[PDB]
Amino acid sequence: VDIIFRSKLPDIYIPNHLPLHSYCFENISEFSSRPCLINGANKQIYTYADVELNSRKVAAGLHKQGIQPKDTIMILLPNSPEFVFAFIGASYLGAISTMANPLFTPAEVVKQAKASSAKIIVTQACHVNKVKDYAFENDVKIICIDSAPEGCLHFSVLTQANEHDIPEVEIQPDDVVALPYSSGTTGLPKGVMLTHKGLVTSVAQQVDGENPNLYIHSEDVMLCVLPLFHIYSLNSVLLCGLRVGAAILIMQKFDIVSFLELIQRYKVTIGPFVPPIVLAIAKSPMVDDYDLSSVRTVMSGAAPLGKELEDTVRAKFPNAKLGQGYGMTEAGPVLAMCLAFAKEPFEIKSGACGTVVRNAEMKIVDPKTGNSLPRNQSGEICIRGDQIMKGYLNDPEATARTIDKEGWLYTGDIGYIDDDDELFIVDRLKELIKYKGFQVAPAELEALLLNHPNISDAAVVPMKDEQAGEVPVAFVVRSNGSTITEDEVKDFISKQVIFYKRIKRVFFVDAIPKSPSGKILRKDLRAKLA
Ligand SMILES: Nc1ncnc2c1ncn2[C@@H]1O[C@H](COP(=O)(O)OP(=O)(O)OP(=O)(O)O)[C@@H](O)[C@H]1O
Ligand SMILES: [Mg+2]
């Protein structure tokens, strides 16, 4: 007998029979002349009508270039209007976009291209070298958004196409539309098949309903400073933004000053961040010199964030609801979303990752028995609903091990749900540090380290130890100014925690490695230790 957790919100109608473009643009007529994409680099504004129009032009363009239903294009781009136009244009065709980290090595880009069977790679001149030979040898066309050197087509060859030249197409709910990849935090990146049905479901779960979990409307301005090739931005910023008619402000590269200025300048109202952004915000002393009163909702997604740091940043946006969302590529991606974001906001506790999304079921399973758990007990987070992935790309066996025959997705994440239906993430199961019979969550310690005014960044990993099995160790970046000592660090931790959570060694460093998508690269630090 499974003990099953659900949202405090009612189930709603989800039109997951509609293709993604059709769902996203369903209500476009009520906001057609509102800004859709704001290019922060050049101040250029595309209206809702511009964006549908360019997307339809690109679809027609892709079709003339040989893109057929179920064919794949690769997007190898930084955030830009053209990323959007390509993604949606492929969708118009019943085709598929795979999205690649543009700072990947040539071996990486090629592997992804081979695996996804991309017929076209849409990128910039600066990356052409990565895929030049491979493309020629495999009749894969290369289209550049900026200038098109030897053998490449320019993106304009897509936008020259006529919007009324999109062919008749029969799109199935279960057709793939997106091939995002996991961030590779725990190993090589995995290709994930996301469907029209999955993504419409997941966008609806967030922004539709009488009382939506994530309340966004056509007068909001959503900042987009996270990579759209990761599923958190593409879904919760781009697709959710389109669905409700919000302006999407496109930044390329976060730095705290640029960030604050653009927020002020463009009157951003929705801030979809990650813990490294929140960390920056909490440690900067100048946040107070800026007019951030417009910001009404601040989300942190993508990675563990502790309550003390979350609270620090809370105090710096007294005008906003601040809270967390929890996503996993394999999950569509959103599994839970802060209810302080709802149109009729619920109460929340600091440090929760949210409450499981409506129109879904969640269970917490102990991984040593396999039995589901009651409230306030730590186990493996599981989820079932229409939003989850069709499966891993070219890997039905891993899919089968990951989503069981009951249609339960097993995240590999440990968590508990408390009496208020808030979810808390402990850490990734395999990241739990094994000190005798005890299990230590690296993220709990990291949260406490980040609390120290003289610490600017940190990561906790296990070390090989003779009699304990593994001991917790910490990598610490000192603040500018301070010369905090190893023993100062250890004693600071020691005063606050139960004995088996103590830090055995601290190593001072200049930086902690992180994915572009905002997750600490713990494995890279293990390798430094080994
Ligand atoms: N709010 C959150 N708090 C804690 N962890 C989170 C939160 N949001 C996401 N995560 C973590 O991020 C994961 C989703 O990350 P993603 O799908 O980008 O790949 P990854 O797990 O980071 O890397 P890979 O699967 O390639 O090892 C979740 O499984 C969870 O472990
Ligand atoms: Mg993962």
Swiss-Prot record:
Region of interest (SBD2), residue spans: 325-392
Disulfide bridge map: none
Record note on what altering residue 436 to A does: Normal activity against 4-coumarate
Reaction catalysis annotation: (E)-4-coumarate + ATP + CoA = (E)-4-coumaroyl-CoA + AMP + diphosphate; (E)-caffeate + ATP + CoA = (E)-caffeoyl-CoA + AMP + diphosphate; (E)-ferulate + ATP + CoA = (E)-feruloyl-CoA + AMP + diphosphate; (E)-cinnamate + ATP + CoA = (E)-cinnamoyl-CoA + AMP + diphosphate
Family matches, as Gene3D superfamilies: 3.30.300.30, N-terminal domain of ligase-like
Keyword Ligase among UniProt keywords: yes
Protein name, per record: 4-coumarate--CoA ligase 2
Annotated source species: Nicotiana tabacum
Gene name in the database record: 4CL2
